[PDB]
Amino acid sequence: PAKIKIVAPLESALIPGGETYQLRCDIMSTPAATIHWKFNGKLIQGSNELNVEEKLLNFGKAIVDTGIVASILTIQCPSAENSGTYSCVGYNGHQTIETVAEVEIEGEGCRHKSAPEIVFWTDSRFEMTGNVATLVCRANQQVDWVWMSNDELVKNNDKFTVLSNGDLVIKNIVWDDMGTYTCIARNQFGEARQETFLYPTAHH
Amino acid sequence: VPAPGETRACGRKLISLVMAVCGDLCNPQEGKDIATECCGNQCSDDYIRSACCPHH
């Protein structure tokens, strides 16, 4: 049965102007959820789009698809225009949830040519042995992606596909695939990294 | 048996999932036992979700 729950909520805050600020939320969901953010009710990051491709790849299978997704919203140079209500919204195709906070800027040399950031990722994905699973990372711009596992490059082959959007798609998962997969987003100025985690559950 | 580094990463992610499902029904010391069990041995989805709070 589908389920969704806040794991790490937003909290309201009076923050200094002109100092970089970051919000984080984490949501548990089955099937996999996406997160988008709103400011005073208006969409500012992310979308409601879901992993339709993996659902096709798991045609005919009993699917576990559960885990925690995380997202971060960065305000580079907070000013009075950034004061208001921030919402982190989760959606899994069946249910929604949200966590909300009021952020107020207090106070008035704040800065381009910077590394990307990874703003949404699979903190954990559980899926049954024998199915396809996806580890998701999304950046704040178009990027070049590389994935690592066990300190080695993940190469594209019959089992692993690295997509241009930041997904790593792993077919026919087995217990030996359990562990951490690091997504690395690069542009011409530098890189951002994030860890994701896969758990292939037992198939009885 | 998983490599030790995969067991390491697993323990944190598994206890987080168990605590999120079970809430206050799962003491962190009991979630840790399920995390250790299921990060050295492969567990089912049902066991991971229910072992720390069998009455849901």
Side-chain angles (χ1 to χ4, degrees), chain B residues 19-23 25-41:
Chain B
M19 295 303 290
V21 167
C22 290
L25 297 172
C26 184
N27 183 323
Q29 299 193 70
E30 187 173 339
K32 172 270 182 265
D33 296 336
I34 299 299
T36 300
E37 174 178 0
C38 294
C39 295
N41 315 128

PDB file of all heavy atoms in Angstrom, chain B residues 19-41, unseen atoms left out:
ATOM      1  N   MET B  19      13.150   3.587  12.230  1.00  0.00           N
ATOM      2  CA  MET B  19      12.628   4.617  13.139  1.00  0.00           C
ATOM      3  C   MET B  19      11.532   5.433  12.466  1.00  0.00           C
ATOM      4  O   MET B  19      10.554   5.822  13.115  1.00  0.00           O
ATOM      5  CB  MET B  19      13.758   5.532  13.630  1.00  0.00           C
ATOM      6  CG  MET B  19      14.810   4.868  14.495  1.00  0.00           C
ATOM      7  SD  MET B  19      14.140   4.086  15.950  1.00  0.00           S
ATOM      8  CE  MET B  19      13.645   5.538  16.912  1.00  0.00           C
ATOM      9  N   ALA B  20      11.667   5.705  11.163  1.00  0.00           N
ATOM     10  CA  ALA B  20      10.641   6.473  10.468  1.00  0.00           C
ATOM     11  C   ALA B  20       9.325   5.693  10.401  1.00  0.00           C
ATOM     12  O   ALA B  20       8.258   6.265  10.612  1.00  0.00           O
ATOM     13  CB  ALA B  20      11.131   6.836   9.068  1.00  0.00           C
ATOM     14  N   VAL B  21       9.378   4.388  10.103  1.00  0.00           N
ATOM     15  CA  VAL B  21       8.161   3.579  10.067  1.00  0.00           C
ATOM     16  C   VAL B  21       7.548   3.460  11.455  1.00  0.00           C
ATOM     17  O   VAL B  21       6.337   3.648  11.638  1.00  0.00           O
ATOM     18  CB  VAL B  21       8.504   2.192   9.508  1.00  0.00           C
ATOM     19  CG1 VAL B  21       7.326   1.208   9.763  1.00  0.00           C
ATOM     20  CG2 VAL B  21       8.881   2.322   8.039  1.00  0.00           C
ATOM     21  N   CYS B  22       8.359   3.124  12.456  1.00  0.00           N
ATOM     22  CA  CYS B  22       7.810   2.749  13.751  1.00  0.00           C
ATOM     23  C   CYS B  22       7.579   3.922  14.687  1.00  0.00           C
ATOM     24  O   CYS B  22       6.777   3.804  15.615  1.00  0.00           O
ATOM     25  CB  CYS B  22       8.762   1.786  14.445  1.00  0.00           C
ATOM     26  SG  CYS B  22       8.806   0.167  13.657  1.00  0.00           S
ATOM     27  N   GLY B  23       8.276   5.032  14.492  1.00  0.00           N
ATOM     28  CA  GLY B  23       8.133   6.159  15.394  1.00  0.00           C
ATOM     29  C   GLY B  23       8.553   5.776  16.802  1.00  0.00           C
ATOM     30  O   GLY B  23       9.510   5.003  17.001  1.00  0.00           O
ATOM     31  N   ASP B  24       7.825   6.324  17.789  1.00  0.00           N
ATOM     32  CA  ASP B  24       8.091   6.118  19.213  1.00  0.00           C
ATOM     33  C   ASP B  24       7.947   4.662  19.651  1.00  0.00           C
ATOM     34  O   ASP B  24       8.317   4.332  20.793  1.00  0.00           O
ATOM     35  CB  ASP B  24       7.164   7.024  20.062  1.00  0.00           C
ATOM     36  N   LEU B  25       7.403   3.787  18.803  1.00  0.00           N
ATOM     37  CA  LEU B  25       7.303   2.379  19.166  1.00  0.00           C
ATOM     38  C   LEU B  25       8.649   1.671  19.117  1.00  0.00           C
ATOM     39  O   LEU B  25       8.763   0.541  19.620  1.00  0.00           O
ATOM     40  CB  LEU B  25       6.314   1.680  18.229  1.00  0.00           C
ATOM     41  CG  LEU B  25       4.852   2.150  18.265  1.00  0.00           C
ATOM     42  CD1 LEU B  25       4.101   1.477  17.136  1.00  0.00           C
ATOM     43  CD2 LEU B  25       4.248   1.839  19.618  1.00  0.00           C
ATOM     44  N   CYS B  26       9.667   2.296  18.533  1.00  0.00           N
ATOM     45  CA  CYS B  26      10.972   1.668  18.379  1.00  0.00           C
ATOM     46  C   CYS B  26      12.044   2.455  19.137  1.00  0.00           C
ATOM     47  O   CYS B  26      12.403   3.562  18.739  1.00  0.00           O
ATOM     48  CB  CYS B  26      11.322   1.552  16.893  1.00  0.00           C
ATOM     49  SG  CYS B  26      12.893   0.669  16.587  1.00  0.00           S
ATOM     50  N   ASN B  27      12.583   1.868  20.200  1.00  0.00           N
ATOM     51  CA  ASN B  27      13.691   2.479  20.924  1.00  0.00           C
ATOM     52  C   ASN B  27      14.945   2.429  20.048  1.00  0.00           C
ATOM     53  O   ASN B  27      15.169   1.437  19.352  1.00  0.00           O
ATOM     54  CB  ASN B  27      13.908   1.632  22.181  1.00  0.00           C
ATOM     55  CG  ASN B  27      14.979   2.148  23.091  1.00  0.00           C
ATOM     56  OD1 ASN B  27      16.027   2.668  22.684  1.00  0.00           O
ATOM     57  ND2 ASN B  27      14.732   1.979  24.364  1.00  0.00           N
ATOM     58  N   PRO B  28      15.771   3.494  20.023  1.00  0.00           N
ATOM     59  CA  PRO B  28      16.976   3.444  19.169  1.00  0.00           C
ATOM     60  C   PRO B  28      17.861   2.231  19.424  1.00  0.00           C
ATOM     61  O   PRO B  28      18.476   1.716  18.489  1.00  0.00           O
ATOM     62  CB  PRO B  28      17.711   4.746  19.509  1.00  0.00           C
ATOM     63  CG  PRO B  28      16.631   5.692  19.973  1.00  0.00           C
ATOM     64  CD  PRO B  28      15.551   4.830  20.621  1.00  0.00           C
ATOM     65  N   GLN B  29      17.942   1.764  20.667  1.00  0.00           N
ATOM     66  CA  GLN B  29      18.737   0.584  20.970  1.00  0.00           C
ATOM     67  C   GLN B  29      18.118  -0.664  20.351  1.00  0.00           C
ATOM     68  O   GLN B  29      18.847  -1.581  19.970  1.00  0.00           O
ATOM     69  CB  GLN B  29      18.916   0.426  22.492  1.00  0.00           C
ATOM     70  CG  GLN B  29      19.653   1.655  23.090  1.00  0.00           C
ATOM     71  CD  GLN B  29      20.152   1.430  24.519  1.00  0.00           C
ATOM     72  OE1 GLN B  29      21.092   0.652  24.744  1.00  0.00           O
ATOM     73  NE2 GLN B  29      19.521   2.089  25.485  1.00  0.00           N
ATOM     74  N   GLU B  30      16.790  -0.736  20.233  1.00  0.00           N
ATOM     75  CA  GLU B  30      16.225  -1.879  19.526  1.00  0.00           C
ATOM     76  C   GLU B  30      16.275  -1.691  18.008  1.00  0.00           C
ATOM     77  O   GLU B  30      16.422  -2.667  17.257  1.00  0.00           O
ATOM     78  CB  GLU B  30      14.799  -2.144  19.971  1.00  0.00           C
ATOM     79  CG  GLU B  30      14.259  -3.421  19.373  1.00  0.00           C
ATOM     80  CD  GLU B  30      12.913  -3.803  19.924  1.00  0.00           C
ATOM     81  OE1 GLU B  30      12.568  -3.324  21.031  1.00  0.00           O
ATOM     82  OE2 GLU B  30      12.209  -4.573  19.240  1.00  0.00           O
ATOM     83  N   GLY B  31      16.157  -0.460  17.515  1.00  0.00           N
ATOM     84  CA  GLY B  31      16.355  -0.279  16.087  1.00  0.00           C
ATOM     85  C   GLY B  31      17.751  -0.671  15.664  1.00  0.00           C
ATOM     86  O   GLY B  31      17.955  -1.192  14.561  1.00  0.00           O
ATOM     87  N   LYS B  32      18.731  -0.408  16.518  1.00  0.00           N
ATOM     88  CA  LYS B  32      20.110  -0.777  16.215  1.00  0.00           C
ATOM     89  C   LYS B  32      20.261  -2.279  16.046  1.00  0.00           C
ATOM     90  O   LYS B  32      21.046  -2.730  15.200  1.00  0.00           O
ATOM     91  CB  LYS B  32      21.043  -0.208  17.293  1.00  0.00           C
ATOM     92  CG  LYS B  32      22.478  -0.656  17.226  1.00  0.00           C
ATOM     93  CD  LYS B  32      22.672  -1.939  18.061  1.00  0.00           C
ATOM     94  CE  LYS B  32      24.141  -2.422  18.082  1.00  0.00           C
ATOM     95  NZ  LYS B  32      24.610  -3.474  17.092  1.00  0.00           N
ATOM     96  N   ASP B  33      19.531  -3.078  16.845  1.00  0.00           N
ATOM     97  CA  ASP B  33      19.636  -4.533  16.699  1.00  0.00           C
ATOM     98  C   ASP B  33      19.134  -4.975  15.327  1.00  0.00           C
ATOM     99  O   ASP B  33      19.753  -5.833  14.679  1.00  0.00           O
ATOM    100  CB  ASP B  33      18.827  -5.257  17.781  1.00  0.00           C
ATOM    101  CG  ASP B  33      19.352  -5.002  19.188  1.00  0.00           C
ATOM    102  OD1 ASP B  33      20.552  -4.658  19.357  1.00  0.00           O
ATOM    103  OD2 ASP B  33      18.534  -5.130  20.122  1.00  0.00           O
ATOM    104  N   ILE B  34      17.996  -4.422  14.881  1.00  0.00           N
ATOM    105  CA  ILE B  34      17.460  -4.764  13.558  1.00  0.00           C
ATOM    106  C   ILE B  34      18.383  -4.277  12.459  1.00  0.00           C
ATOM    107  O   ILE B  34      18.620  -4.987  11.459  1.00  0.00           O
ATOM    108  CB  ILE B  34      16.040  -4.206  13.366  1.00  0.00           C
ATOM    109  CG1 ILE B  34      15.105  -4.813  14.414  1.00  0.00           C
ATOM    110  CG2 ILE B  34      15.535  -4.418  11.949  1.00  0.00           C
ATOM    111  CD1 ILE B  34      14.979  -6.235  14.351  1.00  0.00           C
ATOM    112  N   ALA B  35      18.979  -3.090  12.655  1.00  0.00           N
ATOM    113  CA  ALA B  35      19.918  -2.583  11.664  1.00  0.00           C
ATOM    114  C   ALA B  35      21.123  -3.509  11.557  1.00  0.00           C
ATOM    115  O   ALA B  35      21.566  -3.826  10.446  1.00  0.00           O
ATOM    116  CB  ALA B  35      20.329  -1.143  11.996  1.00  0.00           C
ATOM    117  N   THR B  36      21.677  -3.948  12.692  1.00  0.00           N
ATOM    118  CA  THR B  36      22.816  -4.856  12.608  1.00  0.00           C
ATOM    119  C   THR B  36      22.422  -6.168  11.930  1.00  0.00           C
ATOM    120  O   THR B  36      23.110  -6.640  11.020  1.00  0.00           O
ATOM    121  CB  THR B  36      23.379  -5.149  14.002  1.00  0.00           C
ATOM    122  OG1 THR B  36      23.803  -3.896  14.567  1.00  0.00           O
ATOM    123  CG2 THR B  36      24.571  -6.076  13.922  1.00  0.00           C
ATOM    124  N   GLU B  37      21.286  -6.747  12.338  1.00  0.00           N
ATOM    125  CA  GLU B  37      20.820  -7.990  11.737  1.00  0.00           C
ATOM    126  C   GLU B  37      20.682  -7.865  10.230  1.00  0.00           C
ATOM    127  O   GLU B  37      21.187  -8.706   9.461  1.00  0.00           O
ATOM    128  CB  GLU B  37      19.467  -8.370  12.344  1.00  0.00           C
ATOM    129  CG  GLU B  37      18.887  -9.579  11.635  1.00  0.00           C
ATOM    130  CD  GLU B  37      17.559 -10.053  12.199  1.00  0.00           C
ATOM    131  OE1 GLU B  37      17.044  -9.454  13.176  1.00  0.00           O
ATOM    132  OE2 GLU B  37      17.023 -11.071  11.663  1.00  0.00           O
ATOM    133  N   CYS B  38      20.008  -6.812   9.780  1.00  0.00           N
ATOM    134  CA  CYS B  38      19.666  -6.713   8.366  1.00  0.00           C
ATOM    135  C   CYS B  38      20.770  -6.075   7.536  1.00  0.00           C
ATOM    136  O   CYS B  38      20.657  -6.001   6.314  1.00  0.00           O
ATOM    137  CB  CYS B  38      18.355  -5.989   8.217  1.00  0.00           C
ATOM    138  SG  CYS B  38      16.991  -7.006   8.947  1.00  0.00           S
ATOM    139  N   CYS B  39      21.867  -5.657   8.159  1.00  0.00           N
ATOM    140  CA  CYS B  39      23.002  -5.153   7.401  1.00  0.00           C
ATOM    141  C   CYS B  39      24.140  -6.143   7.313  1.00  0.00           C
ATOM    142  O   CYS B  39      25.109  -5.895   6.575  1.00  0.00           O
ATOM    143  CB  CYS B  39      23.454  -3.797   7.928  1.00  0.00           C
ATOM    144  SG  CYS B  39      22.164  -2.540   7.667  1.00  0.00           S
ATOM    145  N   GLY B  40      24.050  -7.250   8.041  1.00  0.00           N
ATOM    146  CA  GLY B  40      24.924  -8.388   7.843  1.00  0.00           C
ATOM    147  C   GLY B  40      24.262  -9.530   7.093  1.00  0.00           C
ATOM    148  O   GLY B  40      24.976 -10.353   6.478  1.00  0.00           O
ATOM    149  N   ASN B  41      22.929  -9.634   7.156  1.00  0.00           N
ATOM    150  CA  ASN B  41      22.142 -10.650   6.455  1.00  0.00           C
ATOM    151  C   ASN B  41      21.061  -9.957   5.649  1.00  0.00           C
ATOM    152  O   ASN B  41      20.545  -8.906   6.041  1.00  0.00           O
ATOM    153  CB  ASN B  41      21.360 -11.584   7.441  1.00  0.00           C
ATOM    154  CG  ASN B  41      22.189 -12.066   8.630  1.00  0.00           C
ATOM    155  OD1 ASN B  41      21.748 -11.911   9.803  1.00  0.00           O
ATOM    156  ND2 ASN B  41      23.374 -12.617   8.369  1.00  0.00           N
TER     157      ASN B  41
END
